[PDB]
């Protein structure tokens, strides 16, 4: 197994306040495949200046998906306090065929800081974190959201300048507020901008260290790091699984401005991924420096027939979900 660094030496976990109702907003961003939302590029062959019919894994037209939001944590003036999160860790969802993710759509526009709904701020992109695995259950106090055996964790870090992917056993820790300890509400990750995100010194392990406060990492088969260029550009992220492993897709390298998703990693994860959950993250800022973080949207993939329209440049810029209605079926037959 891989060395993933020392365990947390902290005697306890940070207290976590779950207030789902502050995170239940209707900020609708549904799939529009006529703009090629949520399209993974067909693998094995490229196409150019042509319209084809293709069977693959696609979102359905108009799917609202599931929205997730991250928030600044509690703070009194200069002192951060409890984390502040939604109930995402208890909401385990079925992986099925995988999913695609709309990231940073609201960035640059005016938004709310969540924890203080009247305080407004310019929305900034934030990356989602995921927990995926093949066996789930409950923590000792009965709360849902526990992943057993080897679990895949996708965890951004470094103030959004890297992504970590690792496959380890998650051993819940036993200190106060930890998942096998006293007064457990939810696990969460966090970072502290004042000491984690000044210029030229981004802590590449802030989020990982906060994760290690809730779980000891055991028998880790791999830990991969992917560097991220910093910007406010919206992007798409996807994940599927085949017998060859878990496949990670992004728009960033090949189609940064257009959103087409291409595979950038294959993970040696060969147990069938059946469940996933969104890992809550809370930003430990002081009151006067809270930011607004853009919501991310997850949409499930299913085997569907799409008409795909490729531009001269080779990119998909328009598609048709043929099974949407009778008229769409005939459009796909040209």
């Amino acid at each position, epitope marked *: 197994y891989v060395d993933v660094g020392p365990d947390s*030496v902290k*005697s*306890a976990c940070i207290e976590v306040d779950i207030q789902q109702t502050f995170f239940d907003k209707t900020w609708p961003r549904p799939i529009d495949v006529s703009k090629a939302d949520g399209i993974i590029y067909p693998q094995g062959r490229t196409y150019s200046n042509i319209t084809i019919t293709y069977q693959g894994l696609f979102p359905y037209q108009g799917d609202h998906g599931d929205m997730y939001v991250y928030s600044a944590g509690h703070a009194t003036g*200069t002192t951060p306090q409890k984390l502040f999160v939604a109930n995402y860790s208890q909401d385990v969802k079925q992986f099925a065929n995988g999913f695609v993710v709309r990231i940073g759509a609201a960035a640059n526009s005016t938004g709310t800081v969540i924890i203080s709904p009247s305080t407004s701020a310019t929305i900034r992109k934030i990356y989602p974190a995921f927990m995926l695995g093949s066996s789930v259950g409950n923590f*000792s106090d009965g709360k849902m959201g526990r992943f057993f055996n080897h679990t895949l964790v996708l965890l951004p870090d470094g103030c959004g300048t890297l992504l970590r992917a690792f496959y380890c056993i998650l051993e*819940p820790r*036993s*200190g106060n507020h930890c998942p*096998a300890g*006293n007064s457990y509400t939810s696990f969460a990750t966090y970072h502290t901008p004042a000491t984690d995100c000044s210029d030229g010194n981004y802590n590449r392990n802030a989020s990982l260290n906060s994760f290690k406060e809730y779980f000891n990492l055991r028998n880790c088969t791999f830990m991969y790091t992917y560097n991220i260029t910093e910007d406010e550009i919206l992007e798409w992220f996807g994940i599927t699984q085949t017998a060859q492993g878990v496949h990670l897709f992004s728009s960033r390298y090949v189609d940064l401005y257009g959103g087409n998703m291409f595979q950038f990693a294959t993970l040696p994860v060969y147990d069938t991924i059946k469940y996933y959950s969104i890992i809550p993250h809370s930003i430990r800022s002081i009151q006067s420096d809270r930011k607004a973080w853009a919501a991310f949207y997850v949409y499930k993939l299913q085997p569907l027939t799409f008409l795909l329209d490729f531009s001269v440049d080779g990119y998909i810029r328009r598609a048709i979900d043929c099974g949407f209605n009778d008229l769409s079926q005939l459009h796909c037959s040209y």
Partner: antibody
Amino acid sequence: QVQLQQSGGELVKPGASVKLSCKTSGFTFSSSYISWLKQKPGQSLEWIAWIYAGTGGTEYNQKFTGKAQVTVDTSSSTAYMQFSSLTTEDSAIYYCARGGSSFAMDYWGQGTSVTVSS
Amino acid sequence: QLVLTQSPASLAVSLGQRATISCRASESVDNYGISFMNWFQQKPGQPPKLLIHTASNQGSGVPARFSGSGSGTDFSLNIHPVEDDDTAMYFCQQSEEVPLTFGAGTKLEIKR
């Protein structure tokens, strides 16, 4: 009244094992931390391990990993510590205390004397 | 790994006067003002007794003459007015990092 009642002193030869117990009363066992600690005469205290009785979750001093195992029986509000591979350096008084993680140890057992000698 | 150095190793105080024991942690115990620092008294043949927790909060039933203060790396236990039963060992102890560690102890003796 709050009571942590530790088992009687033991003399054991080097290499032997001992199981110390700590029968508790007068407070909610299932929601408290139980810690075990070591003290040699004239010396400060050394924390060995804790267990959260409600879940069985444990945290160990890595100096004692492989030699100490703490368990609880929640039906009798009793904490146990199994000590194995004992050395003459393990001769000391051993305490159970209620406390652990960030909770200060506020109630203490009377102590169990362990002598490791041939 | 987190080391607490107490000062002084011993001290002798007359009845009714102040005793001041200080504890310095090698790294910072504080988390934005709240420090998991405890103080204990131990008399001969007895288990320790909790005096102070979280730096400055008194244990249940602990006489008001024992008081704790400090933050970050520096803490102190003040005993005033000192009484004859206060002759004992005093230990600081941190509960912020694993392994939990104690100071080496300060012996308080009463002058007569």
